[PDB]
Design a protein around this ligand. Structure first.
Ligand SMILES: COc1ccc(S(C)(=O)=O)cc1NC(=O)N1CCC[C@H](C(N)=O)C1
Ligand SMILES: [Zn+2]
Length: 139
């Protein structure tokens, strides 16, 4: 679990969005596993606007932060789950690191701010949904 809070927006994994997120929907994209909902309270997370390929992510299944080197956002094949059929997920960045399904939502950050959130994983792999291209999150 986990979300990004910026301006009057809440960014979460689409597969973990609540009834309240859908009732206050701003934008969603199944191909990216992202959903954005509106908030009444102001948020203070900063979104990175950069091309960093290194950062630190929060891993809730270990209660720890780990440094990672990750690939540039791309279309990556993701096996079927209870949430989606087998498909290419877009804007996904992979790295070597520990992740379990419940780790989705953990923030990936570089020195410029929030890069994305955990969205996929594998055996010794962790995948992050990029949010740096969503320029409208800042206006
Ligand atoms: C952090 O997630 C995992 C971590 C580890 C593994 S495993 C035990 O196969 O190594 C599997 C996963 N599960 C995972 O990638 N997804 C399930 C939830 C929806 C995700 C999506 N964006 O399509 C896909
Ligand atoms: Zn950066």
């Amino acid at each position: 679990s986990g979300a990004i809070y910026v301006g009057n927006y809440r960014v979460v994994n689409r597969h973990l969005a609540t009834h309240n997120d859908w009732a206050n929907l701003v934008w969603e994209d199944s191909s990216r596993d992202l959903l954005v909902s509106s908030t009444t309270a102001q948020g203070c997370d900063t979104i990175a606007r950069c091309d960093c390929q290194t950062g630190v992510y929060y891993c809730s299944s270990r209660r720890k932060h780990y440094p990672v080197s990750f690939s540039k956002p791309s279309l990556i094949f993701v096996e079927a789950s209870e949430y989606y059929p087998a498909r290419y997920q877009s804007h996904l960045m992979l790295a070597v690191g520990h992740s379990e399904p419940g780790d989705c939502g953990g923030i990936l950050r570089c020195q410029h701010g929030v890069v994305g959130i955990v969205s996929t994983g594998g055996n010794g792999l962790v995948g992050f949904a990029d949010v740096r291209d969503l320029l409208w999150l800042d206006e």
